[PDB]
Every structure is written in C-alpha cells, then in structure tokens.
Amino acid sequence: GSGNSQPIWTNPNAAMTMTNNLVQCASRSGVLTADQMDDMGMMADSVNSQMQKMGPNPPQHRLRAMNTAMAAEVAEVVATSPPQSYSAVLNTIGACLRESMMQATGSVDNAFTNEVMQLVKMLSADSANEVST
Amino acid sequence: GSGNSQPIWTNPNAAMTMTNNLVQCASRSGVLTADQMDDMGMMADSVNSQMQKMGPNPPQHRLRAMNTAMAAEVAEVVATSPPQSYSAVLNTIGACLRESMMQATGSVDNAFTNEVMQLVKMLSADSANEVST
C-alpha cells in the first residue's frame, strides 16, 4: 500500500504476458480442473484473438475493458472449485498473479491482483444481505 | 429474489440477445459515453466471434465463464462513469438488464442482473481498509 498501485494495462503484450503466465502457473500447480484450465486457456486466447481482430494498435478503452474481463474470468474459474479446493486454487492463483506480474513487467501490481481477490470472493458469496448478527 | 433463478445462459444465442439489447438500450438512453458504449459494443462482438470459434454449441463450462465476462464488461463501463453519472448509468443498465432478459428469454434472469449490480458497486470501490470507525 505504498503510494499508488500502477496497473500495467497500457501495453497489451505486457499485460497478455501475465495472462499467459497465469495459465502456465496453473498448469504447473495442478490445483485446477479441466474446467478451470480450459477457461483460463480461452482467456489468454480471447485476449490474443481480440487483438488480432483490431490490429497492432487497438483503442486503449478496449484494453481497459480487457482488464476486468481477464480478472473476472480467473475469479469465475477459482469460484467454480469445490469448497476444499477453492481455498487451494485461490491461494495458488493469488500467488500466480504476483509472479506473473514480476515476469511480465518486473514489478508486482496489486491493483489487478486485489481486484481478482474481491471478484472471486464475491462470486463465492451468495448473500444479498449482511448475514452478521 | 423470488425463489431461485435458472441462468438463461443455457442458450448462448439467447444470452447474446441480451448483450445486443443492452447496447441498444444504452444507445437509446444515451447516458453512457462513446468509450463505454463502444466497449459494450465490442462486448457483443467478442461473445459473437468467440461463439463462432467454439461452434454452434461451445463447451458448457465456457458458457459458465462467459456469463461473468459479459456482466463484468457492463459493470466496468458503468463504474468508469463520472462520479455523478455513475448512479445515472447504473440505474440505466439495471433497468435495461431486466427488459433485455424479458425480450430475450421471456423471463428476468436474477442471477445475471444481480451479478452486474454487485460487480459494478465493487468495481468502483477501491478501499481495502476500514473507512468506518
């Protein structure tokens, strides 16, 4: 929480590197299932295939929307796991995000990493009311 | 809210119909900026072209993921609105959500409509510390 977290979402290739590294990290952890690995697989694919539809220089606002797309996909992925596996996959991905950032840009962004954490918890929180009394 | 709600993503084209209706409803309201409108537009395109890549009947688990992807894109654009327009766009999308579903499947999908509302509120809430006493 030192200062401001700098989202690497400005260079699409650099950001895509994190997406690729996530799948590789998941593939070498084995905590995830065919569901998760294939959804994350098409996650990296979608980013790639949408870019090739646009060109070597797409509109930055689209990359903006890709930020939450990639993040939400991973969260949906993790939240699909059984209760016992959920914590394990979450822990794994939560670490994979950190590493992927360091391998992509060289520094760890917390903005994206944090967003995914809040996403995955929310997808796993079936509560429309504060059930705390 | 009334009982449970069966996700209308049992048919990808039926769901895609909502994606199209959302853009139309947003375009006809004009509450959203060109940025947010075009991102929602490419949201329809991304699902559209992704579907083609996966065939007339893509993997069921991928449709599961795509559910949250579409919702996240709408939530992001709403959460990227000005501080005074955020409430305006939010209300607009929430209204269009219901109508879109009713004109797409014939019923109001609570799961997706609720997901977007939770997403957008969280998406614009960057505060991981207790702001309350």
> Is residue B1 in some structural domain?
no
Q: Which residues from B are below 8 Å from A128, CB to CB?
A: 1, 114
Which experimental method was this entry solved with? NMR
* Residues in chain A, total: 133
Structural domain for B78, as ranges: 12-124
- What is the SS3 string spanning chain A? CCCCCCCCCCCHHHHHHHHHHHHHHHHCCCCCCHHHHHHHHHHHHHHHHHHHHHCCCCCHHHHHHHHHHHHHHHHHHHHCCCHHHHHHHHHHHHHHHHHHHHHHCCCCCHHHHHHHHHHHHHHCCCCCCCCCC
Ramachandran quadrant class, A30 (left: phi over 0; alpha: psi -120 to 50; beta: rest): left
Which of A53, A115, A122 has its CB closest to that of B118? Answer: A122
> Is residue B54 in some structural domain?
yes
Identity at A91, one-letter amino acid code:
N
Which residue on chain B is closest to A115 by alpha carbon?
Answer: B123
Which residue on chain A is closest to B46 by alpha carbon?
Answer: A50
> Is residue B55 in some structural domain?
yes
Q: How many domains does chain A have?
A: 1
Whole-angstrom distance, CA of residue B21 vs CA of residue B111: 17
CATH number for position A104: 1.10.274.70
Which of A39, A62, A118 has its CB closest to that of B62? Answer: A39
> Is residue A3 in some structural domain?
no
Kindly determine whether residue A59 and residue B72, on different chains, have CB atoms separated by under 8 Å.
Answer: no
| Min Cα–Cα distance to chain A from B65, Å | 6
Q: Which residues contact A61 (CB under 8 A, 6 or more apart)?
A: B35, B38, B39
Which of B68, B122, B128 has its CB closest to that of A76? Answer: B68
